[PDB]
Symmetry: C2
Subunit: 714 residues, 2 copies
């Protein structure tokens, strides 16, 4: 048994709670897009056929009633005896404050996802006493997480805490002490042994410059110490203090490496430490090679991912600390090569979608609506979780309804009033008007995704509709955006006119989406991907995809050179977590500014950890080829490295890969698949038969957890 | 200044709270239709142009921030200094538990309906620091009621209480005491001077039979008295008790006339009384004639209306005690001739509509969706409140979208899966399949209403659409449902085939909707309205409309005979409030049963007070002819009475009417209009000119508050 609720409703409520924890210099800062709510009245039900009478314990968050075979029980019973035979247990709950949720426990009757929920049962009695026909009522399978204890109330969920001490403190000339915690971290400040009275001010920073800048630092706190109590002035919450040995831990979490603290004359602070907050995670994925710089890049990437893997996958810990679609899709991917936390992926997907009616694109960003669609099928391929797709499908349909009612005469998408056509942070060089080739590519992929999901859930009318729309748009891509002279997809079209500008976005995506044939993909490699004439990318975010394209075209060596220079560049700049944006042309404090503010840039953004994904999927070369890794593919490439080794998690297994200049070892504890080897002459295998795919390329079919060892020579 | 919120959101939240107070034998009983929620994050804003600096006080229910000219203030300030000049004050609030709401007060800056609210501002900052263009953002005028005090938190609203003592108590043979409160009433039971320990059981009833029937009474309570405290077992809420002189008032309200109380041996109850709960109301309407029976009918009707006029207009106080569309539209009408509480009308209209997306008809009842539409224009005609229509319009459009996507090949409405085609409680004699003439008549009226509202708000595209649809459906009414042989509209059509059955519903409505010409209206009078061959009506609900039709055809004398017999019949049966249903053929305890339960019938249903409306509009003969009574019409008819006199409220005035067999007096303190007199020869007026309309009919134009006196002789 476990606590259950209407699917997606707990996630939405919990997401609102977390997102609304963002602050800017002491002020509450909710998202600018619409905030949705859970359904305040829901009915939980379960049809029972018991061979023997059993008693169930009932717990719930909210006001509720209990109906057994149509008969309303008195009040709110905590236990109910269930007779033998066929019965129908119905529990309707009302909860405006937190999501309606129940906990039922018995010998055989237990609350779980096999229970059905609805927010509109429509059962009424006519004047004779006959109940209405509710066979038309729509039900959903109940949602749940891991709250298996009767006392583990879903609404009280909070992340784990762990004590930490700073590694340095320095008194400042203008007063106060500047604490260095060693590296980017996240948590609650603890002040031990407070005495006296007066104000106490906290100033946080991811850099010493931000922490010391009391007037422009992004986040801070202001407290008032009084005899026997202290008060958080920002939220006006007074907590009690013991006169003897006291301790006060701030109520709200903050991201930071440095914390500058000051206080009035009559205040005395014994000790300053913190409570590191985190979501328990198992580092199931792993990677390391001879290049120690890359090793550090991977480690820093993993740490960045963990800090940004909280109640949901977020953009950054300092600023925004909200769930964004563009960032999230990459988090899911990096997650598949690190934690493989499928539960977090689903919670984030539920949250980003929100509820109906649809009033705008995801986060109001057009391209973000498409990432959301793509992320669902990506999750299915890696987890094999068909049930999730079935539960989300209705909401996927209505989101696509919104998009499809906004296409133009060519069936393409153009930014409309209220839309944000983002693409990337390219310093303002990108034209957002007309039909961007990049957006149609994403849109086309979204239609293909919807077609594949419609097929998975069995909606054939929908499937046909999406396939027809996807096929028509796809056939228009080259006739519309391809340019023979530039040998690439132009940036955009306005009134049917191609722009002189060619950006790398539509081109790089067309490579791993496979929208271009072999010949044009190679053309793009030279005319776009390796052409420094084409506008460069300055965010780890799009380098994720730029480099992925290159890896798809087998340019792992050039990519290695780029990853080392780009990410290693942030390290050499003092990074202990990867940033939101990085231009190696800038220097010093310039790296800290963004959004027109001196310390506006987040120095810990989920999308800065790109390497986690690139190395796992293109160097260790692992990826599922059938949902949930029912079937996989391992195509390792060293790309300059002498030796590398790693692990890639799967639903119920792992794929270990080792490789040096003459040997490859693979141990797949789940599924079957092909190990592809690039060699001059035929490789030798300790198992199975090595088959020649083509010139210089070989394959080996692995069909068991027994480690395979092959020797080759490129 | 006053507390403000997103329009409709407070009403919805407050409505959920009230509706969910219904109980059945101790069990919480929420509605079977979907329960909507308020938006949990809303932004309040006001553009200011101050000639001098002023400080405002700020209060709010929920977490909030304050932004002045784009600058986020620290924490949650309770006061803010506003500089002279142009500024923009923005307050974003988050409240999941109760509706986000704020209170601002200054010399000139005050929270009120002139403030704008949105649940999606969409303001974002690009990487340079430039704010997005939010000129496309949709805003609404803030909603409000009468919470003008800084401490009058909207979420704490509750109705007035007034002490009351029972008028009789009788010990019962099977134990306990049966208390008679004299008449149907509503409130909380108070138990003074409790001592001892043990259970205490309450059993409520609108009849002594129900109260004494511990096993089948609709409502009850169970308490546990303990030393120093007592506990409500149904809701598990323990309250403290003083050892000396204590007093405990039950936490939940109940409808009842009789209360049967028992308790264990060791319990001792000093005194039993109650707290009558009610919404403060001014009896602005009034009526009385020579017939003292009708006078009592009007009084009982008024009392029934008041008991059912709580936080919203409800169906009945004992059972359901929910807001239903069919009942509500009649409540609004009876209200215009009694309290003229426009605020209650708007709150109920907001509540019944709920939020988007639309998942079913109002209360899931097809005909109830149409009443909702009609009630909006009815409210406009009587109150002149155009602003309300403008605010509700978007929701009206989406409700009509739902209906229009459910029409058949003839553009008519047929009950679909999940729909409840109600019409009336006619004991199961009404066929609900096919195209009911009654539903198309209501539907057609709904389209005409939407056209008139579209016109009022300025939506011309919509107006044209609705007019076209209304005109096409209207022209199909007679060709489809009229039968020459039966001289009436048949009950329904199935596969284009008329039913042999003719019910009075479509016919009576076509009379006051004016869908039939003079000749057919008279045909209906004889072949339907006065033909006892046609199925009779047994609910006060439809007699409201049946009798109204007859009054429209000037049969006030037959109606008088019906009202006296029908309503006077319930009085002679012991009613102190009018019922949900009444069949004068039944007798004794049969009058108490419904829904297959012995005491299932509500003996206090809003729709049982029909006379309030009939007498005010058709005997005193008053009605507005231009919104808000800008222009009125007074056409008094005695219908058997010797003398009658009354008052009809208007937004800012009243219309007093007096009439006997030779004199008519009218004093209209608002608007202008015609007084129509039925006389053999020309009447004489103390003012203005008496003009002859037609044979035996005269008119007089009243254009001032000066009382007019005319003498006539029928």
């Amino acid at each position: 048994q476990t606590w259950i609720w209407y699917p997606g409703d707990y996630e939405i409520w919990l997401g609102n709670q977390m997102n609304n924890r963002r602050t800017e210099r002491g002020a509450f800062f909710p998202p600018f897009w619409k905030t949705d709510s859970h359904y305040v009245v829901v009915e939980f039900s379960k049809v029972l056929n018991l061979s023997e009478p059993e008693e169930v314990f009932i717990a719930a968050e909210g006001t509720y009633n209990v109906k057994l075979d149509g008969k309303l029980q008195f009040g709110m019973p905590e236990t109910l005896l269930l007779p033998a035979g066929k019965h129908s247990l119905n529990i309707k709950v009302w909860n405006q404050a937190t999501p309606p949720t129940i906990y039922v426990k018995g010998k055989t009757v237990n609350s779980d996802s096999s229970w059905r929920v609805t927010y509109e049962d429509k059962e009424w009695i006519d004047e004779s006493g006959k109940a209405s026909d509710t066979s038309a009522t729509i039900y959903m399978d109940a949602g749940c997480w891991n709250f298996d204890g009767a006392t583990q109330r879903p609404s009280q969920f909070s992340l784990m805490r762990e004590p930490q001490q700073p590694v340095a403190k320095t008194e400042q000339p203008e007063g106060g002490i500047l604490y260095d915690f060693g590296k980017e971290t996240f948590g609650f400040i603890t002040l031990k042994n407070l005495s006296g009275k007066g104000k106490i001010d906290l100033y946080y920073g991811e850099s010493p410059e931000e922490a010391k800048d009391k007037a422009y630092c992004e986040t801070l706190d202001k407290l008032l110490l009084e005899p026997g109590q202290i008060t958080d002035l920002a939220i006006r919450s007074t907590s009690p203090l013991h006169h003897s040995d006291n301790e006060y831990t701030l109520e709200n979490s903050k991201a930071f490496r440095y914390v500058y603290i000051t206080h009035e004359p009559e205040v005395q602070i014994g000790e300053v430490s913190m409570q590191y907050e985190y979501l328990p995670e198992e580092y199931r994925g792993n990677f390391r090679c001879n290049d120690e710089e890359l090793n550090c890049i991977w480690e820093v990437g993993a740490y960045t991912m963990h800090l940004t893997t909280r109640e949901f996958f977020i953009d950054g810990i300092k600023r925004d600390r909200w769930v964004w679609s563009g960032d999230a899709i990459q988090s899911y991917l990096m997650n598949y090569y690190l934690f493989f936390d499928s539960e977090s992926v689903k919670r984030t997907i539920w949250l980003l979608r929100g509820k109906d009616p649809v009033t705008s694109h995801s986060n109001t960003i057009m391209d973000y609506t498409f990432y959301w669609f793509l992320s669902v099928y990506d999750y299915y391929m890696y987890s094999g979780d068909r049930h999730f797709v079935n539960q989300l499908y209705p909401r996927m349909q209505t989101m696509m309804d919104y998009v499809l009612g906004r296409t133009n005469k060519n069936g393409m998408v153009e930014g409309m009033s209220g839309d944000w056509v983002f693409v990337d942070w390219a310093d303002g060089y990108l034209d957002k008007k007309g039909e961007l080739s990049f957006e149609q590519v994403l849109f086309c992929r979204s239609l293909e995704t919807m077609a594949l999901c419609a097929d998975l859930v069995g909606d054939k009318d929908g499937q046909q509709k999406y396939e027809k729309l996807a096929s028509a748009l796809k056939a228009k891509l080259e006739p519309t955006f391809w340019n023979n002279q530039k040998q690439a997809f132009v940036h955009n079209c306005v009134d049917g006119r191609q722009s002189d500008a060619v950006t790398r976005y539509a081109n790089m995506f067309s490579v791993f989406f496979d929208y271009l044939n072999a010949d044009k993909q190679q053309a793009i490699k030279q005319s776009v991907l390796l052409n420094d004439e084409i506008l460069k990318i300055t965010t780890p975010y799009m380098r994720f995809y730029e480099l992925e394209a290159l890896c798809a075209l087998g340019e792992q060596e050039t990519v290695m050179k780029e990853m080392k220079a780009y990410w290693g560049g942030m390290l050499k700049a003092g990074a202990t977590s990867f940033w939101e944006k990085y231009n190696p042309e800038e220097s010093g404090t310039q790296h800290l500014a963004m959004y027109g503010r001196p310390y506006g840039k987040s120095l810990c953004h989920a999308w800065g950890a790109s390497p986690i994904y690139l190395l796992g999927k293109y160097y260790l070369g692992v990826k599922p080829t059938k949902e949930g890794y029912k079937e996989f593919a391992v195509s390792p490439v060293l790309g300059g490295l002498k030796w590398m080794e790693g692990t890639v998690p799967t639903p119920n297994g792992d794929i270990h890969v080792y490789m040096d200049n003459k040997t490859i070892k693979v141990k797949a504890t789940e599924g079957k698949g092909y190990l592809t080897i690039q060699s001059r002459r035929q490789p030798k295998a300790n198992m199975g038969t090595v088959e020649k795919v083509s010139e210089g390329v070989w394959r080996l079919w692995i069909d068991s957890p027994e480690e395979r060892i092959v020797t080759y020579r490129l």
